[PDB]
Amino acid sequence: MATGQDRVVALVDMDCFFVQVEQRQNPHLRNKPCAVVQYKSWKGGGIIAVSYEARAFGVTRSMWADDAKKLCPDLLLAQVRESRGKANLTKYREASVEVMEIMSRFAVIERASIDEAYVDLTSAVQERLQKLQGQPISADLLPSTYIEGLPQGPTVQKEGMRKQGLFQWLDSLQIDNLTSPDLQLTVGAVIVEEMRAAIERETGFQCSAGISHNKVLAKLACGLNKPNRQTLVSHGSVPQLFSQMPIRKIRSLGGKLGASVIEILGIEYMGELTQFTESQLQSHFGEKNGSWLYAMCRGIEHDPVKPRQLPKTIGCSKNFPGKTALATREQVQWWLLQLAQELEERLTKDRNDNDRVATQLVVSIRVQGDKRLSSLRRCCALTRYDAHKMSHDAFTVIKNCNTSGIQTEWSPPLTMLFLCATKFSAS
DNA sequence: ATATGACGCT
DNA sequence: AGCGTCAT
Numbered sequence A: 001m002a003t004g005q006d007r008v009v010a011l012v013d014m015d016c017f018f019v020q021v022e023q024r025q026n027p028h029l030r031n032k033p034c035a036v037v038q039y040k041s042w043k044g045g046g047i048i049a050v051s052y053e054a055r056a057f058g059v060t061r062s063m064w065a066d067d068a069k070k071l072c073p074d075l076l077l078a079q080v081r082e083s084r085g086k087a088n089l090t091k092y093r094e095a096s097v098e099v100m101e102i103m104s105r106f107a108v109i110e111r112a113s114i115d116e117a118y119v120d121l122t123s124a125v126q127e128r129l130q131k132l133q134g135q136p137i138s139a140d141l142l143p144s145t146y147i148e149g150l151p152q153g154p155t156v157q158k159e160g161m162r163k164q165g166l167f168q169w170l171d172s173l174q175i176d177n178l179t180s181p182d183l184q185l186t187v188g189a190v191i192v193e194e195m196r197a198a199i200e201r202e203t204g205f206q207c208s209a210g211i212s213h214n215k216v217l218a219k220l221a222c223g224l225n226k227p228n229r230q231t232l233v234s235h236g237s238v239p240q241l242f243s244q245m246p247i248r249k250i251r252s253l254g255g256k257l258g259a260s261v262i263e264i265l266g267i268e269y270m271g272e273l274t275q276f277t278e279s280q281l282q283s284h285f286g287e288k289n290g291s292w293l294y295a296m297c298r299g300i301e302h303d304p305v306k307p308r309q310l311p312k313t314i315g316c317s318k319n320f321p322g323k324t325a326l327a328t329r330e331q332v333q334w335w336l337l338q339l340a341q342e343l344e345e346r347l348t349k350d351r352n353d354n355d356r357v358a359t360q361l362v363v364s365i366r367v368q369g370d371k372r373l374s375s376l377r378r379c380c381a382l383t384r385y386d387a388h389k390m391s392h393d394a395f396t397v398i399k400n401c402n403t404s405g406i407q408t409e410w411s412p413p414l415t416m417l418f419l420c421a422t423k424f425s426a427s
Numbered sequence B: 001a002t003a004t005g006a007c008g009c010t
Numbered sequence C: 001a002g003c004g005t006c007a008t
């Protein structure tokens, strides 16, 4: 066993991100139950982000604003900007950039969503460990850090607990030895406190972090103490932590695979996987998955933090649910044009900022009926950032999908259009 | 009826 | 190349 204690990895995720972006801009919304919403026309718009004050009333994502007002009569709402007849997320992308640029200053980051990134702090920890000369680590360096699983053994409020675990941890801490993994996580954590102070100081956004030995544990830990707090999950904390951790809560196990592990194995919790041999697990779920479950239920995972702060694709989509589905060749050309146009603006920007060009265009459509996300995908060359050309070509490579013998109509009505630029390349 | 992005498998 | 899974 290489006790997967070779790296220090952190995941930083912003608290109710879209809400914070709106609240920084409109101070009236601060410290109040509020949500960000998309498309006012239908039931007040669907909710995409909720403040913690509003979560306390039960408001969630996937909820009509109308319905959320019932749980929470005083809920304030901000709408997503809308442009060319669709949601426009530029404000959130720009806020995201602010945050990525700051984290990038500390370390090598992997952009994992619009509001989170992974950081590999192995080197910064090592470096910081040479320049602190065996000087102890004070609790005052860790003003927002929880140590998962402490306190234990021999104040009933939350900050009281926080501190006692932190004190126990630190008093435990094995400081004259620099190869200690726990000490490294600690130093990593001091670093992420700094990171997190820089982010708030420079953008006014609060976030949470997890600090551990790998991406999966870091991500899990991030959630344990949201909002505005960070959590160190040490290797030794894993058996107790996983012993009642529902399987679905681990990254990549929230879907069918996780369900099949539960069903086939007849278990509920991560820790229960330890009782199987790697071979048994590979027989059930394949070589890479068995291997991966066998390691992961023991807290070990080697997926690296990828040095990638820029998306691999840029894309645009719109659903036409139910009656609104597109059923004329005019509707299809016109929305393709609407989408091509945003994509053109986002591409030109991208090229200026990041010295690269996309080279392939991916057209996706959904049809009325077909089960889920995409029904059909077709590719063509992306050679000019021209919305009219991208539109034209996108149509070209999907027109044959139209079963309508009549020239004007489109059948079946399309319930989704998606354009995506991909295959980027230095420029 | 609530816009996006990464990546594996064939 | 085109489809399927998993995620925010």
Ligand SMILES: Nc1ccn([C@H]2C[C@H](O)[C@@H](COP(=O)(O)NP(=O)(O)OP(=O)(O)O)O2)c(=O)n1
Pocket: A013, A014, A015, A016, A017, A018, A019, A048, A049, A050, A061, A114, A115, A226, A227, C008
């Ligand atoms: N299904 C989803 C999930 C998130 N998002 C957007 C809005 C979120 O504010 C933002 C960040 O995602 P998120 O981390 O899952 N949630 P959020 O940051 O809002 O709240 P917490 O992380 O504090 O729980 O992505 C979305 O548009 N659709």
Ligand SMILES: [Mg+2]
Pocket: A013, A014, A015, A016, A017, A115
């Ligand atoms: Mg978040």
Ligand SMILES: [Mg+2]
Pocket: A013, A014, A113, A115, A116, C008
């Ligand atoms: Mg997130």
